Amino acid sequence: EVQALVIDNGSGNVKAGVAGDDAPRSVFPSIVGRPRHGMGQKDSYVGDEAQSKRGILTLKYPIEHGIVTNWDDMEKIWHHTFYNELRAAPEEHPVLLTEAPLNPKGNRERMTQIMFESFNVPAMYVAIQAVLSLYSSGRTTGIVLDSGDGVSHTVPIYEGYALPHAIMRLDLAGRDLTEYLMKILHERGYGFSTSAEKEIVRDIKEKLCYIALNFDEEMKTSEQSSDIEKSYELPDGNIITVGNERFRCPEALFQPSFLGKEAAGIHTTTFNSIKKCDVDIRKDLYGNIVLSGGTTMYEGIGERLTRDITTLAPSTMKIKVVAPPERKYSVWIGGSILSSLSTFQQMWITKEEYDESGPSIVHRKCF
Amino acid sequence: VEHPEFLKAGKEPGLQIWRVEKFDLVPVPPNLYGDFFTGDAYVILKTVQLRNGNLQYDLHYWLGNECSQDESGAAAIFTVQLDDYLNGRAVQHREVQGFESSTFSGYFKSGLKYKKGGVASGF
Ligand SMILES: Nc1ncnc2c1ncn2[C@@H]1O[C@H](COP(=O)(O)OP(=O)(O)OP(=O)(O)O)[C@@H](O)[C@H]1O
Ligand SMILES: [Ca+2]
Ligand SMILES: [Ca+2]
Ligand SMILES: [Ca+2]
């Protein structure tokens, strides 16, 4: 009868819903706005209601690169998630949360203290996001490439558990690609700058952009014809056009130099991540490269990786890049499934346990 | 306090098969071993006796071509959990319909059988 709540926190978007559901019922931006300096102020706004009041608000992202940086704001996000979005009392439901890889032990405890002390939950569990994605793909062993709005991660997983020594971080993600698109569109005179104009450009990116199988060759053939050119209707009613920017933009994932970064591309970062793993399992990693996150939704991305990795890997090594259509919510879906299992009923951290052991209990109960 | 099927798991040498039914691990009738629903997901544990008295474990989670995501993910998780319950001494295997390893198919003398249909999704 009584199902549990599942929340996948993100640098840009929150995914919340109920276990047993095949998808999250609520998806809103991880933004918190407060007055910069009369009546129902109110005091603090969240999500879409905050973006609809930019004029009198100093907006902030509680999570930065997959990591919480403001707990006062993080607590506000969760409040809105429970009472305004889900319409469910936290004290009446278990709560499955997600966390980035290499999440400091301090944040795990803090996130636990809040759930029990502030929202008075009966139960709680925390899971690594990428591990949930692999589970949703129906795998116990594989390497996940999670790329969202604020951070990208490659994390090898073997028999259910991840390998921290081989996990690689990358401060290149969708928001950087958004900012990059705004920059190159000045080659057409289009002057997008405002935080409002940043959201419309974000849509152009998600609608028109695609991964070129061969960048140098794609650039040549695209310059000749006009089929590359696509139109996009601005919300005012004006119509602009976009051409090679469609694959120049998401190319920063493979060539961070376009953004002014000495970092390595995702194909190379995925390669190095696997190389750090024991030899006896590399085959299973190469043959189960799973994608998750919205930034991995670009058309023709698997075709690029599948061929770019083969260039680096042994000639004999079979390579399969998996691109599930639902991979925008693959993390959440993994949570929904896991927290629905008959066996998980005794893996929860209970209230009794917290009162007896405190926030430090999360380290021993969650992996 | 703990899942009865886990308590049954890997105690005697032989072959155990469970099917995922609505976010739960259910035993398959012994007289239906070898017959898999293409629309479901199964968990298989082969137990072998060693010279030193200990038991060897191999965990194969089988995924039908028409199985739903909740079933496929549950099988995976169940495999990890059953592996941990067995002190992690079990080797995990992902078996997809049509690409089953020789080891897996070799478990069945009369051969692997496919059947259409299956239990409904937990979604
Ligand atoms: N169809 C699409 N094509 C390309 N990019 C997309 C598409 N849909 C969404 N995105 C991008 O994916 C990002 C959102 O992904 P997600 O919701 O996983 O972010 P997140 O979970 O907050 O990121 P993080 O990994 O930092 O937590 C946005 O930056 C958005 O621009
Ligand atoms: Ca994310
Ligand atoms: Ca089924
Ligand atoms: Ca094991």
Residue numbers in the entry:
A (entry chain A): 5 to 41, 47 to 376
B (entry chain G): 27 to 149
From the paper:
Malaria parasites have two actin isoforms, which are among the most divergent within the actin family that comprises highly conserved proteins, essential in all eukaryotic cells. In Plasmodium, actin is indispensable for motility and, thus, the infectivity of the deadly parasite. Plasmodium actin I is abundant and expressed throughout the life cycle of the parasite, whereas actin II is present only in the gametocytes and mosquito stages, including sporozoites, the highly motile form of the parasite, transmitted to the vertebrate by the mosquito. Although Plasmodium lacks a gelsolin homolog, the mammalian G1 is bound between subdomains 1 and 3 in both Plasmodium actins, similarly to other actin–G1 complexes.
Because of the observed differences in sequence, conformation, and helical symmetry between Plasmodium and canonical actins and the importance of the D-loop-mediated contacts for polymerization, we constructed a chimera, in which the entire D-loop of actin I was replaced with that of α-actin. A chimeric actin I mutant that forms long filaments in vitro also rescues gametogenesis in parasites lacking actin II. To further characterize the filaments formed by the actin I–α-actin chimera, we analyzed electron cryo-micrographs of JAS-stabilized chimera filaments and subjected them to the same classification and symmetry analysis. Based on the determined half-pitch distance and the symmetry analysis, we conclude that the symmetry parameters of the chimera filaments are in close agreement with the wild-type actin I filaments. Therefore, the symmetry parameters appear to be retained from the wild-type actin I, and thus, the D-loop of canonical actin merely confers increased filament stability. The D-loop in the chimera is slightly more ordered. In addition, the C-terminal helix is visible and can be superimposed with the C terminus of actin II and most canonical actins. Yet, the sequence of the α-actin D-loop alone is sufficient to restore the ability of actin I to form long filaments, without altering the symmetry compared to the JAS-stabilized wild-type actin I filaments. By generating transgenic parasites expressing the actin I–α-actin chimera, we found that this mutant protein was able to function almost as well as actin II in vivo. This strongly confirms the in vitro experiments and supports the notion that the D-loop has a significant role in determining the polymerization properties of the parasite actins.
